[PDB]
Amino acid sequence: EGGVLTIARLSDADNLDPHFITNIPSASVVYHKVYENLVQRDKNMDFKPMLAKEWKQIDDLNWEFKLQQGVTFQDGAPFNAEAVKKNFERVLDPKTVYSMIQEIKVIDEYTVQFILKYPYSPLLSIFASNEGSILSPKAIDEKGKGLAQHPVGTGPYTFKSWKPGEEIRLEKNKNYWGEKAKVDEVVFKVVPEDATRIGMIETSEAHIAENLPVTEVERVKNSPSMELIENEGLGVEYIGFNVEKKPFDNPLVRQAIAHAIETKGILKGVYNNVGTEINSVMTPKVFGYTKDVKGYKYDINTAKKLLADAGYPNGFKTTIWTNDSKVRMALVEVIQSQLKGIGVDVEIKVMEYGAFLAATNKSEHAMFVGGWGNATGDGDYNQYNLFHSSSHGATGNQFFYSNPEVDKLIEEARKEKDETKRKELYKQLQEIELKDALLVPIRGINHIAATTKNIKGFWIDPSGYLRLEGVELQ
Amino acid sequence: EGGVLTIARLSDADNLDPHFITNIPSASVVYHKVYENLVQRDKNMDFKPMLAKEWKQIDDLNWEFKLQQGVTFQDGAPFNAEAVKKNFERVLDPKTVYSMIQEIKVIDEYTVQFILKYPYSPLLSIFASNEGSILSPKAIDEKGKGLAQHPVGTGPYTFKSWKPGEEIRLEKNKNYWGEKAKVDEVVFKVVPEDATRIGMIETSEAHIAENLPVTEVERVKNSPSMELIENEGLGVEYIGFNVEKKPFDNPLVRQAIAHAIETKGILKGVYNNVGTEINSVMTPKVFGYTKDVKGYKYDINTAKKLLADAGYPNGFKTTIWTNDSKVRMALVEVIQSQLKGIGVDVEIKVMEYGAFLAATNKSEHAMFVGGWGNATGDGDYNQYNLFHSSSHGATGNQFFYSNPEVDKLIEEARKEKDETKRKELYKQLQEIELKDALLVPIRGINHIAATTKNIKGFWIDPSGYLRLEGVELQ
C-alpha cells in the first residue's frame, strides 16, 4: 500500500474547474479523485450511493437527497446540505446544464432538496457526470487560489501541484472518508509522442499509457510487460444522412446505402477491432438501449434493387463530409469503395473540425461522418441532441430530421417517472430512427490504454474517464 | 471462351520496351502476354521450357539452347536462333544486365549458344525475367513504330492500342503457338482512386483491381462479389543497420535491438496481415533460401541485458531513416515504441525517396527501413547488391558491410555450377548475416489484388507480375 503511480498521456488538462471542464483529459484528472458526486453508476450502469446515502423523487419536480455523514473536504470544510446547495448555486439560474433547477432547499444538515422548474427524469445522470462534482464551500467563499488551477473536494486524492504542460500531481488524501487510496501519489505526466508513452511502460517510467493509436494495439497485446485495457464506451460513430439533401429525402435511397455498407471490415481493417459492433444509435451502456432494432443486412443485391426502385438504376453522384483525421480518412475511403459497388459515386469532402461543424450547421452536406459521446449514459442526451427538430445543425441533429412523433416521444421520455416506460419510449425512438435509416452505425467507441502487468484494479469507465478506485501497485 | 477482360490499376505503363522497363506496372502489361522468354519458372520456382525446348551448360562459359519449332512473332516473322541472337545483341557489349555475354553463336536454325566473358550461374534467372523478353527481329530492323509504344512478340496477346494515361488494350493472338487465350481482349484501365478500382468489381466495370491499400483488405474479403488474391512475393522488408554508424558497429547492440523487435504485431497491426513472416534476408521463393537461420527471439529482458553488456545500461539516442509513406510511418512508430521499451530513444528521419537514397549513399543513417525486390528469384541478386563490399550505398549495401569472407562466398556462389553447392553457399551467407544481426526482417512482401468471383486461373507471380495464362471468364 504505497508508491507513485505514473500516468503518461498525450496532453495536459486545460482547466480543473468541473463546472467549466469541456474535455476528457481534464475531467479524468479530478473525477472520483479530487472530487466526488452525490451518486455514481455501478458496473450494470445502476445509480448507487456516493456523497448521497439515499435519494427519492417526490411528486415530479422535487428530488430529495440524504447525505453521507462524517465527510470532510480536503481543506477541512465539513460536507453537508449547505455545501451541496452552495456548489449547485454556482451553476443555477431561477428563470447551463442545471437550467432546470428553480430552487435548492436545505431541509436539515444532511438533507437537501432540488426543486425543478420543469420535469427532468435524467437528473441523476447529470449529478453522476463530472459537472456534478461537489466543490469545497471554503474554496468558493474564502480568499485564495482559483478553482481552475487548485481543485478541492472530498475525494481520495488531494491536489498537490501543477507544472503546466508537464505534469499534474495528486497525493493520497489520508483523511478520505471511504476506502483510502493504496498509492501515495498519482502523476499525470504529459508525453506527446505516442510511441514513447507506450515504451515507458516497459522501462517502468510509467504504469499507464493513455491515448493509444490503433496501429499500436498489437504491439501492446504482444508485449510481455503490459496489458491492453479496452473498455466499453458510450460514444457512437456512424455514417449519417442529411435527410433534406436530395436524393437522401427518399427513404429507399437511405435504405439502399445502409444495405451497401459492411462494418466488420471497417472495424477490423481500419480500427484493428478497437470498438464494438452495434446496430443502434446508442451503445449497450446508454440507458434506453435495445438489442431488438432494425438493422440493414449487408446485401449489395438488395442495395442495387432499392436504388433502381428509388429511380436510380445507374446510381448517382454525392458527397461524404468528415473532419480531417488519418483514421477517418481510411473510414470514408472504405465507405466510398462500398458505395461505388452499387453505382454511387462518392466525393470525399474533408476539412478541419471548425469548418466541418460550420458546413454541417448550414446544411451543406449530404452524407457525413458523425460521432456522439452520449456522456451522461442516458437516452435523453443521445435523443434530444441528435434527433429532436430544435437541435438542427452543429447542436447534433446534422440529419436535419424533424418528425413530430419523434419530438413528442423525446419530450415524453424526458418527463416520464417510470424507468420501464422510459425504456419503452427510447426503444420506440430507436425503431423509428433505424427504420427511417437516418444513419448507419459504424461502431461503439471503445477507450484503449496500456498498463504495466504490475497494476491491479485499473479501468476506464464508459465516459472515457480513468478510474483509480481500488487500484493497487504490485 | 471469349469476352473483354478489364484490369483496373493505379497507373499506366510508361514504356513497353522490355530492355528499358524499370517498373512492375509496365512489365505486367507485356510479360508472358505480348512477349515470351527462353525459359520460365514453375510453381516450385524450377526452370521449365518456354521458347527454348531444352538447354545445357557446356563447360562454365557456354550455354546452349534448343528452340521451339513452329513459332511465329505477331508480325509474321519466324522465331528462330537468328531472332534470339538479334534480340540479345540489342543488350550486348563484348568488352547492362547482359554485360557477361562475349558472343552469341547461331549453331543452326533452332540452336543458339551464349558465350560468357566470365562465369555467371544465375544466367537462367535473367532469361526468365522481363528483360529476357524476345522482340521481333522485324520490329528491330524494318521501318516502323517504336518498340516503346508498340511491342511485338510471340505471346498469346497481340498489342492493339494505347491511349496514354487511360488504357492499354491487347487482343487475343489467334495465331499463338501454345494454348490460345480464352478471352478476346485484355484492357489495362488507368483508375487512380483506390476505392473506385475495387468498387468497379461489384458493378462489373472491372474484373481485376490491382494496387490495393492494406486498409481495403477486409472490405475485399467480406464482399460476396469478389475474392482477395494474395501471392507469395520475392520482396523483403527489414530494419537494417549502418554497421559503421556508432554504436551499431558493436554486434551486441545490433543483437539487443533485434531481440527488442516483435514482427507479428507489425504484420497484423500495420499491414493487416498482408505479407509473410520471415527470419531471413530472402523469401522462401528465392533460390538459396534456408528455414534454418538464427532468429533473435523477441525478448525484452535479453535485449536490456545485451545493451547493458554492450556498455549502454541506460540506453542511447539514435535515428531511424525511411522514405515518406503512410504505412512506413506506422511501421517506424511501432519500432520507435518497441526500442523505447529497452531505453533506446529513436528519432524518426523521414524524407522523400530521392533524398533518402542520397542520404543512405553518404552513410548519414544509423537504422533504416530497407526493401529489396529480389526480382530474379536468385540468391545472387539478393546477396551481391545487399551484402557485397563493392555495393556500399544506394546500390543496396546500405549496411556499409564489408566482410571479406562474405565477398568470397558471394563471388564463389555466382560461379558455382552445382545447384546443391550453390544452395549451401547461400545458406552459409544467410547464417553469417543473421548471426551478425545486420538486419531485422519485418516481412516477405506479398502482392494483393481483388478479382470478380467470375474469374478462374488468375494469379500474381512472386515478382508482382499479373499472370493471365489459363485465365477464363465464367
Beta-carbon separation of A336 and B196 below 8 A: yes
Q: Which residue has the cell 449487408?
A: A298
Give all strands of the β-sheet with A62-67 in edge-to-edge order.
Answer: A52-58, A62-67, A111-116, A101-108
Chosen for mutation from A203, A219, A443 (greatest number of chain B CBs closer than 10 Å) is: A219
Of A218, A298, A333, the CB nearest to B265: A218
How far CA A176 is from CA of A129, A132, A137, A371, in Å, comes to 21, 19, 17, 38
CA dist B443 and B446 (Å) reads 9
Answer left, alpha or beta for residue B146, where phi above 0 means left and psi between -120 and 50 means alpha: beta
Nearest chain B CA: its distance from A380 CA (Å): 35
Tally of CB atoms within 10 A around A78: 16
CA-wise closest residue to A455 among A468, A471, A433: A471
Give me the residue from B194, B272, B341 closest to A199, CB to CB: B341
Give residue B374's identity as a one-letter amino acid code: N
Please say whether the beta carbons of A160 and A16 come within 8 A. no
Cβ-contact B320, B366 below 8 angstroms: yes
DSSP string, B181-194: PSSSEEEEEE---H
Angle value at C-alpha A185, between A182 and A190, nearest 5 degrees: 130
Query: Alpha-carbon torsion A243, A246, A249, A253, what sign?
Result: negative
Grid coordinates of A413: 421520455
- CB-closest option in B201, B222, B343 to A265: B222
Tell me: do A262 and A180 sit in the same domain. no
Q: Is the distance from CB of B346 to CB of B212 less than 8 angstroms? A: no
Which helix (H) or strand (E) segment is B53 a member of?
Answer: strand B52-58
Task: Report the C-alpha gap between B230 and B286 in whole angstroms.
Answer: 17
Specify whether A140 is located in the same domain as A86.
Answer: yes
- Spatial distance between the Cα atoms of B2 and A83, rounded to a whole number of angstroms: 85
Q: What is the CA radius of gyration of chain B?
A: 24
Q: Which residues of B touch A264 (CB under 8 A)?
A: 218, 222
**Is the peptide bond prior to A313 cis by the omega test (within 30 degrees of 0)?**
no
Place of cell 419530450: A411
Please report how the helices B300-309 and B251-260 are oriented relative to each other, as an axis angle in degrees rounded to 10: 160
Is the domain of B166 the same as that of B303?
A: no
What residues of B are in contact with residue A194 (Cβ under 8 Å)?
Answer: 333, 337
Q: Which of A216, A217, A265 sits opposite B219 (nearest CB)?
A: A265
Q: How far is CA B336 from CA A276, B239, B269, B312, B331, in A?
A: 29, 11, 15, 17, 9
Which stretches of B92-192 are assigned E, i.e. beta strand?
Answer: 101-108, 111-116, 157-163, 167-172, 185-190
Asked if A222 lies within 8 A of B298 by C-beta distance, the reply is yes
B-chain residues within 8 Å CB-CB of A262? 219, 222-223
Q: How far apart are CA B401 and CA B387, in angstroms?
A: 6
The C-alpha atoms of residue B293 and residue A174 are separated, in whole angstroms, by 58
The closest alpha carbon to A426, from A384, A371, A372, A376, belongs to A384
* Beta-strand relationship, A167-172 and B101-108: unpaired
Q: Which three cell numbers stand for residue B139?
A: 520490329
> Is residue A9 within 8 Å of A207, Cβ to Cβ?
no
Q: Quick check: B225 and A200 CB within 8 A?
A: no
Count of CB atoms situated within 10 Å of the CB of A47: 18
Q: Which residues contact A305 (CB under 8 A, 6 or more apart)?
A: none
- Residue B398: count other Cβ atoms within 10 Å of its Cβ: 27
Residues A161 and A142 in one domain: no
Amino acid at B269: G
Q: Residue B426 contacts by C-beta under 8 Å, 6 or more apart in sequence?
A: B282, B287, B288, B289, B290, B379, B383, B413
Q: Assess whether B4 and B16 both reside in one domain.
A: no
Instruction: From residue B353, give the alpha-carbon distance in Å to each of B13, B174, B335, B442.
Output: 20, 44, 20, 20
C-alpha cell at B201: 468489381
| Rounded Cα gap, residues B206 and B298, in angstroms | 44
Number of structural domains (chain A) is 3
Inter-chain CB proximity B221 and A265 less than 8 Å: yes
Length of chain B: 474
Compute the nearest-CA separation of B212 from chain A (Å): 11
- What residue has cell string 515507458? A200
What residue type is assigned to position A156 of the chain? P
Give the chain A residue whose CA is nearest to the CA of B196. Answer: A337
User: Between chains, do B340 and A270 touch, taking CB under 8 Å as contact?
Assistant: no
Please give the Cα distance from B388 to B374 (Å, whole number): 15
CA distances from B455 to A371, B2, B188 (A): 40, 12, 16
Helix (H, G, I), strand (E, B) or coil at B419: helix
Decide which of A128, A154, A180 is a domain's last residue.
A154
Pair B195, A336: CB distance under 8 Å: yes
Q: Which of B215, B337, B340 sits opposite A330 (nearest CB)?
A: B215
Rounded to 10 deg, the angle between the A419-435 and A379-387 helix axes is 40
Same domain, yes or no: A245 and A370: yes
Which class for A354: exposed (0-12), middle (13-18), buried (19 or more C-beta within 10 A)?
A: exposed
* B187 and B76 co-located in one domain: no
In whole angstroms, give the CA distance from residue A212 to residue A400. 34
Residues of the domain holding A169: 1-11+155-229+449-474
Tell me the chain B residues in contact with residue A300 when contact means C-beta distances shorter than 8 Å.
202, 223-225
How many angstroms separate the CA atoms of B474 and B227, rounded? Answer: 14
Angle between helices A404-415 and A419-435 (to 10 degrees): 160
**For residue A47, what are the CA distances in angstroms to A37, A285, A290, B52, B108?**
11, 13, 19, 82, 95
CA distance B115 to B95: 13
**Residue position matching grid coordinates 451502456:** A285
Nearest CA to A29 out of A125, A159, A138, A135 is that of A159
Do β-strands A236-241 and A439-444 pair in parallel, antiparallel, or remain unpaired?
antiparallel
Q: Which residues in chain B have Cβ-Cβ distances shorter than 8 Å to A330? A: 215
The one-letter code for the residue type at B389 is: S
Taking contacts as CB-CB distances below 8 angstroms, the residues of chain B near A228 are: none
Distance from the B87 Cα atom to the nearest Cα atom in chain A, whole angstroms:
44
CA atoms of B59 and B417, how far apart (whole Å): 9
Question: Are B185 and B169 a contacting pair, CB within 8 Å?
Answer: yes
Residues A328 and A305 in one domain: yes
8 A C-beta contact, residue B96 and residue B106: no
**Residues A73 and A153 sit within 8 Å (Cβ to Cβ):** yes
Burial of B233 (0-12, 13-18, 19+ CB in 10 A): buried
Question: What is the three-state SS of chain A?
Answer: CCCEEEEEECCCCCCCCCCCCCCHHHHHHHECCCECCCEEECCCCCEEECCEEEEEEECCCEEEEEECCCCECCCCCECCHHHHHHHHHCCCCCCCCCCCEEEEEEEECCEEEEEECCCCCCHHHHHCCHHHCCCCHHHHHCCCCCCCCCCCCCCCEEEEEEECCCEEEEEECCCCCCCCCCCCEEEEEECCCHHHHHHHHHHCCCCEECCCCHHHHHHHHCCCCEEEEEECCCCEEEEEECCCCCCCCCHHHHHHHHHHCCCHHHHHHCCCCCCECCCCCCCCCCECCCCCCCCCCCCHHHHHHHHHHCCCCCCEEEEEEEECCHHHHHHHHHHHHHHHCCCEEEEEEEECHHHHHHHHHCCCCCEEEEEECCCCCEHHHHHHHHHCHHHECCCCECCCCCCHHHHHHHHHHHHCCCHHHHHHHHHHHHHHHHHCCCEEEEEECCEEEEEECCEECCEECCCCCEECCCCEEC
Cβ pair B448, B228 in contact under 8 A? yes
Q: Smallest Cβ distance to A224: which of B202, B266, B300? A: B300
Judge: B341–A201 Cβ closer than 8 Å, yes or no: yes
CB contact under 8 A, A219 and B300: no
User: Which of these three, A103, A138, A154, is where a domain ends?
Assistant: A154
The closest alpha carbon to A369, from A411, A334, A405, A417, belongs to A334
Residues B98 and B70: beta-carbon distance below 8 Å: no
Contact assessment for residue A56 and residue A64, using Cβ atoms and an 8 Å cutoff: yes
Report the C-alpha gap between B15 and B22 in whole angstroms: 9
> Among B106, B137, B154, where does a domain finish?
B154
**Cell numbers 525446348: residue:** B53
For chain A, which residues lie within 8 Å of any Cβ of chain B, measuring from their own Cβ? Answer: 193-196, 198-203, 213-219, 221-225, 262, 264-266, 268-270, 272, 298, 300, 326, 330, 333-334, 336-343, 346
Beta-carbon contacts of residue B96 (< 8 Å; ≥ 6 apart): none
Same structural domain, A61 and A179: no
Cα–Cα distances in Å, from B172 out to A149, B154, B169, B175, B465?
Answer: 77, 12, 10, 9, 19
Cα–Cα distance, B238 to B434 (Å, whole number) = 12
The neighbouring-strand residues paired with B186 are B5, B170
**A440 in the same domain as A326:** yes
C-alpha distance from residue B279 to each of B309, B376, B380, B434, B435 (Å): 25, 20, 19, 8, 11
Q: Is the peptide bond before A441 cis (omega within 30 degrees of 0)?
A: no
How many Å lie between the alpha carbon of B439 and the closest alpha carbon of chain A? 20
Residues across chain A: 474
Do B49 and B186 lie in a common domain?
A: no
Residues of B in contact with A328 (CB under 8 A): none
Question: Backbone dihedral region of B343: left (phi > 0), alpha (psi from -120 to 50 degrees) or beta?
Answer: left
Are the C-beta atoms of residues B339 and B296 closer than 8 Å to each other?
A: no
Please tell me what DSSP assigns to residue B79.
P
User: How far apart are the two ends of chain B, measured CA to CA in Å?
Assistant: 9
Q: How far is B329 from chain A (nearest CA, A)?
A: 10
Rounded to the nearest angstrom, the minimum Cα separation between A216 and chain B is: 6
Q: How many CB atoms lie within 10 A of CB B164?
A: 11
Kindly give the pairing relationship between strand A39-41 and strand A47-49: antiparallel
A352 and A458: one domain? no
Q: Is B21 helix (H, G, I), strand (E, B) or coil?
A: coil
Determine phi and psi for B384, rounding to 5 degrees: -60, -45
Q: What is the largest CA-CA distance in chain B?
A: 73
Contact A237, A443 (CB under 8 A): yes
Instruction: Name the amino acid, one letter, at B59.
Output: D
Interface test with B, best of A201, A302, A337, A448 (most B CBs within 10 A): A337
How many angstroms separate the CA atoms of A13 and A159, rounded? Answer: 13
